[PDB]
From a paper:
A major focus of SARS-CoV-2 research involves the trimeric spike glycoprotein, a type-1 fusion machine responsible for receptor engagement and viral entry into target cells. Two proline mutations, originally developed for the MERS coronavirus spike, have been shown to stabilize the soluble trimeric ectodomain in its prefusion conformation. When combined with the T4-bacteriophage foldon trimerization domain and a mutated furin site to prevent cleavage, the “S2P” construct has become the de facto protein format for research into the biological function of the SARS-CoV-2 spike.
We found that transferring 8-day aged S2P protein into a buffer of pH 5.5 for 10 min restored its DSC-melting profile to a shape nearly identical to that of the fresh protein and restored a fully folded conformation of compact trimeric particles as revealed by NS-EM. To determine if the impact of low-pH-induced refolding could be maintained upon returning the protein to neutral pH, the 8-day aged protein that was subjected to the 10-min low-pH treatment was transferred back into PBS using buffer exchange and then reassessed by DSC and NS-EM. Such pH-treated protein exhibited essentially identical melting temperature to that of the freshly purified protein and retained its folded, trimeric conformation. To determine if prolonged storage and transient exposure to mild acidic conditions are associated with structural changes in the folded spike, we used cryo-electron microscopy (cryo-EM) and single particle analysis to solve structures of the spike immediately after purification (0 day), following storage at neutral pH and 4 °C for about 30 days (∼30 days), and after a brief incubation of 12-day aged spike at pH 5.5 followed by returning it to neutral pH (12 days, pH 5.5–7.4). The final cryo-EM datasets for fresh, aged, and refolded spike contained 403,167, 95,641, and 252,067 particles, respectively, and the corresponding maps were refined to resolutions of 2.6 Å, 3.5 Å, and 3.2 Å. Overall, the structures of the three spike proteins were very similar (r.m.s.d. < 1 Å).
Residue numbers in the entry:
A (entry chain A): 32 to 66, 82 to 95, 102 to 109, 115 to 121, 126 to 130, 167 to 171, 189 to 196, 200 to 208, ...
B (entry chain A): 919 to 1144
C (entry chain B): 722 to 829, 855 to 1065
D (entry chain A): 574 to 620, 633 to 675, 689 to 721
Write the structure that this text describes.
């Protein structure tokens, strides 16, 4: 429903409404339920109910804490974006929380010994920071006309009226 | 009808008090000015984070990363981009100030003509027949409380332009000739108050074969015993 | 009977800023992102102008809450109002003088669009016909409460009583007054039906709004020191890091043209406000009452006035 | 806007694509969450797919309105659209209608009738 919102940068901000064009998982998108062969388009949201096996056929490995890559280091949500970055937070219900970053640094992946697989898309959100600098809300602009109106006025409440938001144009179908 | 007029005035002041003491948002014309000024200042502040073609929007990390031979080429773009935004802001403030000045001149004319005297201009000091007005102060504005006369509860009658009595037409000093079906009376124009037609509230001009619509009646003579 | 013409509103134009600067080019719309919020400023200014133009027409014409009707017995003591009252043979509310006035004014995409008004010409004609019917059947009483009926000859008698002349003058010269009024309306009808062009104040607004749009279209064929005025030719002849410095010059010139246009549109709308406020005050003090101000409603001792609609304007007929 | 075919020598014309605009008619967020979408002057046949086809399609002189049930009544105007058409939110939905200019009244004029007020109201 509303999953896959992290802190897009390392700069502290508070009580603002910042607009970030970043690769996100779109709201109300369909994800596969497992209880195998999993491709890699641009980035994968992961959840669970041990570790991971990445690569193409080098191999990127996480077991459980030791990591083989060469590099080595000694209800759970995981954003695996690759610029390989791991975001993680644990406490699919209707809830929503911001995923704090953990660590920093492929055409398929796998897992060790139920989970979920999402796929990130080029989007543009509108984050709501708070007094403590954490994220409490977000708005996907290209979901519906109401959220596009919220992205235009840059608020989360809209007054009664009529608002010009964008324009449309049929794309060129084929080349000649 | 002094007591009735007093109670109606008190009830009207109480209803103004109630419609302000509720959550009825009425000061939108005053809130618009504050909103537009705050929005113009917020846009002018947010224009400082644009780089206008340069490598950054901060002047300090340009000066601490480049030498003055090829740093001024970066600085000139920011100088032109900020001059343009200042010029736009000042131009639109000059255009808003003339509208505010026209509204202030209208408020001064209303203060002179509605409060310091009684006005005959229609719908200038409220809707109806103007009596008097009161000022009340507001944040960056003024609020006028116009007190007007409104007629109510009309009634149909039969009218006539003149009266022929002794072969002479009779015209009213002020008011209209009305009739309730059997008798004829002269009354004033804005409040029904019928009176007997005598030779002290009429005047005579000519004979009664020229006016289109003249009606026979008796015009009383007040010096009856002498 | 004289004629007074005032402008009320003008054409509601809108601009697609991104398309006018560089349509169908994402690597130019990404270069327009380096300038902050300019197109939102320009769209906010033009949207405020567009709402302002509907507010002008609303406050000039919508000054009644009823819609009055003229009675089917038109016996008004000898006066003849058929040239200005509505005519049902035509498919509108419009009248004969209003047909002449609508036929006199005859002038009438890179983002440049024109928005329609809120009130239509038929609705504005219904407002003016309600104003005429209320005036003729009730005097000035319908602007201060409930419309009270009165015969038209008695109304005209104590409109004479408000300029210092008694009412026996009217009740003894009624036929002459009626014939002079009918001949004056006929002379107005003849001087409007002839080829005299008297709607110059309304034609000036249309010509001044057309020249600005034609200049704004004409500025798209200037190179501004670049190699071409066509963006696709630069994008097909150059690599991107050499096309940057040409697209920047085109963006700078087209932003300068847009800003000049928007500033002059703001300054031109500022006087249409003043003309619409003057027209609203003249409506309230000439049509809804009788005015003692010298040379405000006509030229002479004022009796009564009639409103007529016009393309982006209003015409008063002062008696 | 015109060009010659370089192989068949044919005179074939050029016109641009659709190019409209999009407005969003909505109440407050403290009342509902449904919207309506106005497409600027496209005549409803060349037009998100729920807001492209389906029921609740209405043709205006200002454009193509999708998501609002047109009725035959006439109310005080609530949200202006253009050319006489207004919109309002009324088991609850968004409607579109032709706005009314006021009530109906006919003054009972004759040549010998007058109406005189008998009372008053201080306002
Ligand atoms: C019109 O007004 C006259 C005012 O005089 C009315 O005449 C009086 O009516 C009362 C009835 O209450 C009688 O007691 C008086 O004797 C009448 N006076 C005269 C001089 O006739 C008359 O009734 C009214 N007519 C209508 C139809 O209301
Ligand atoms: C108003 O009164 C006058 C005077 O009584 C009427 O005039 C004359 O009336 C008599 C009798 O009715 C006629 O024989 C005369 O021919 C009338 N003279 C004129 C010059 O008309 C008059 O008819 C009355 N009007 C009404 C409407 O009753
Ligand atoms: C008011 O003036 C008009 C003229 O504008 C009169 O209309 C004429 O009506 C007669 C028939 O009654 C026609 O034969 C004429 O052709 C009409 N004139 C025109 C110019 O078409 C109208 O009759 C006048 N009103 C009254 C009550 O006399
Ligand atoms: C004054 O008289 C007129 C004329 O009778 C009244 O208007 C009538 O109102 C009724 C409504 O009950 C209609 O059926 C009639 O058709 C109307 N007559 C005309 C000629 O239009 C009017 O209501 C009266 N007003 C007052 C205050 O008494
Ligand atoms: C004029 O209207 C006023 C209403 O504003 C009437 O005053 C009311 O009269 C009734 C009589 O039954 C009293 O019960 C109310 O208390 C009065 N109201 C106030 C505010 O005093 C008045 O009677 C009317 N006058 C006429 C002649 O009808
Ligand atoms: C911020 O944290 C404090 C305690 O750490 C808490 O009392 C407060 O409610 C928090 N505010 C928000 C907006 O979460
Ligand atoms: C008023 O009109 C009627 C016809 O309805 C007519 O008989 C009467 O003579 C007229 N009155 C005047 C004064 O013209
Ligand atoms: C618009 O559509 C209607 C019917 O859908 C049609 O009658 C009319 O001709 C169309 N107009 C244009 C300009 O295509
Ligand atoms: C509105 O009126 C038209 C008649 O012109 C009718 O065909 C249509 O069904 C009506 N629609 C509604 C919702 O009443």
């Amino acid at each position: 429903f509303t999953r896959g919102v992290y802190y897009p940068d390392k700069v502290f901000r508070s009580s603002v409404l910042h607009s970030t064009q970043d690769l996100f998982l779109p709201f109300f998108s369909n994800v596969t339920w497992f209880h195998p062969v999993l491709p890699f388009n641009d980035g994968v949201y992961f959840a669970s109910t041990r570790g991971w096996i990445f690569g193409t056929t080098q191999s990127l490995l996480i077991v459980n804490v030791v990591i083989k890559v060469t590099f080595e280091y000694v209800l759970r949500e995981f954003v695996f974006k690759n610029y390989f970055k791991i975001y993680s937070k644990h406490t699919l219900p209707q809830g929503f929380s911001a995923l704090e970053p953990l660590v920093d640094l492929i055409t398929r992946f796998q897992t060790l010994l139920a989970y979920y697989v999402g796929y990130l898309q080029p989007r543009t959100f509108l984050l709501k920071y708070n007094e403590n600098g954490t994220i409490t809300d977000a708005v996907d602009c290209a979901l519906d006309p109401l959220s596009e109106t919220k992205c235009t006025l840059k608020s989360f409440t809209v007054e009664k009226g009529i608002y010009q938001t964008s324009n449309f144009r049929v794309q060129p179908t084929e080349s000649i | 009808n002094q007591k009735l007029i007093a109670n109606q005035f008190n009830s009207a002041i109480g209803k103004i008090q109630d419609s302000l003491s509720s959550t009825a948002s009425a000061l939108g014309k005053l809130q618009d000015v504050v909103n537009q000024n705050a929005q113009a200042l917020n846009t002018l502040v947010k224009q400082l984070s644009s780089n206008f073609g340069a490598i950054s929007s901060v002047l300090n990390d340009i000066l601490s990363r480049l030498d003055p031979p090829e740093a001024e080429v970066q600085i000139d773009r920011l100088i032109t981009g900020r001059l343009q935004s200042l010029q736009t802001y000042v131009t639109q403030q000059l255009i808003r100030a003339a509208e505010i000045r026209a509204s202030a001149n209208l408020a001064a004319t209303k203060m002179s003509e509605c409060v310091l005297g009684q006005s005959k201009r229609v719908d200038f000091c409220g809707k109806g027949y103007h009596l008097m007005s009161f000022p009340q102060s507001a944040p960056h504005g003024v609020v006028f409380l116009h007190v007007t006369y409104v007629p109510a509860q009309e009634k149909n009658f039969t009218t006539a332009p003149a009266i022929c009595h002794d072969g002479k037409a009779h015209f009213p000093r002020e008011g209209v000739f009305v009739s309730n079906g059997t008798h004829w009376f002269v009354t004033q124009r804005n409040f029904y108050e019928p009176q007997i037609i005598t030779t002290d509230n009429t005047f005579v001009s000519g004979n009664c074969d020229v006016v289109i619509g003249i009606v026979n009646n008796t015009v009383y003579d007040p010096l009856q015993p002498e | 009977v004289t004629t007074e013409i005032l402008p009320v509103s003008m054409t509601k134009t809108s601009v697609d800023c991104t398309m006018y600067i560089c349509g169908d080019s994402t690597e130019c719309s990404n270069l327009l992102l380096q300038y902050g919020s300019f197109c939102t400023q320009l769209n906010r200014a033009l949207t405020g102008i567009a709402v302002e133009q509907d507010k002008n027409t609303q406050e000039v014409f919508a000054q009644v809450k009823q819609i009055y009707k003229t009675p089917p017995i038109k016996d008004f003591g000898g006066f003849n109002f058929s040239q200005i009252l509505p005519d049902p043979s035509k498919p509108s509310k419009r009248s004969f003088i209003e047909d002449l006035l609508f036929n006199k004014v005859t002038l009438i995409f890179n983002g440049l669009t024109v928005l329609p008004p809120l009130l239509t010409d038929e609705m504005i004609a219904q407002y003016t016909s309600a104003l005429l019917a209320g005036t003729i059947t009730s005097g000035w009483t319908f602007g201060a409460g409930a419309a009270l009926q009165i015969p038209f000859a008695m109304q005209m008698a104590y409109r004479f009583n408000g300029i210092g002349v008694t009412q026996n003058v009217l009740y003894e010269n009624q036929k002459l007054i009626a014939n002079q009024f009918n001949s004056a309306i006929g002379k107005i009808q003849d001087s409007l039906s002839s080829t005299a062009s008297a709607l110059g104040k309304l034609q000036d607004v249309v010509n001044q709004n057309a020249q600005a749009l034609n200049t704004l279209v004409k500025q798209l064929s200037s190179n501004f020191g670049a190699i071409s005025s066509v963006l696709n030719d630069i994008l097909s002849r150059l690599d991107p890091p050499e096309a940057e410095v040409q697209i920047d010059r085109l963006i700078t010139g087209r932003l300068q043209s847009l800003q000049t246009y928007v500033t002059q549109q703001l300054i031109r709308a500022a006087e249409i406000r003043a003309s619409a406020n003057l027209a609203a005050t003249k409506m309230s003090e000439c049509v809804l009452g009788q005015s003692k101000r010298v040379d405000f409603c006509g030229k002479g001792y004022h009796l009564m006035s009639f409103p007529q609609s016009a393309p982006h304007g209003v015409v008063f007929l002062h008696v | 806007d015109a060009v010659r075919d370089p192989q068949t020598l044919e005179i074939l014309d050029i016109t641009p694509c659709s190019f409209g605009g999009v407005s969003v008619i909505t109440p407050g967020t403290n009342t509902s969450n449904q919207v309506a979408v106005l497409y600027q002057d496209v005549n409803c046949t060349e037009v998100w797919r729920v807001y492209s086809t389906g029921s609740n399609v209405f043709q205006t002189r200002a454009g193509c309105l999708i998501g609002a049930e047109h009725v035959n009544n006439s109310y005080e105007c609530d949200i202006p659209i253009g050319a006489g058409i207004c919109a309002s939110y009324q088991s609850q939905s968004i409607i579109a209608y032709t706005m009314s200019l006021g009530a109906e009244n006919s003054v009972a004029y004759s040549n010998n009738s007058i109406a005189i007020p008998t009372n008053f109201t201080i306002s």
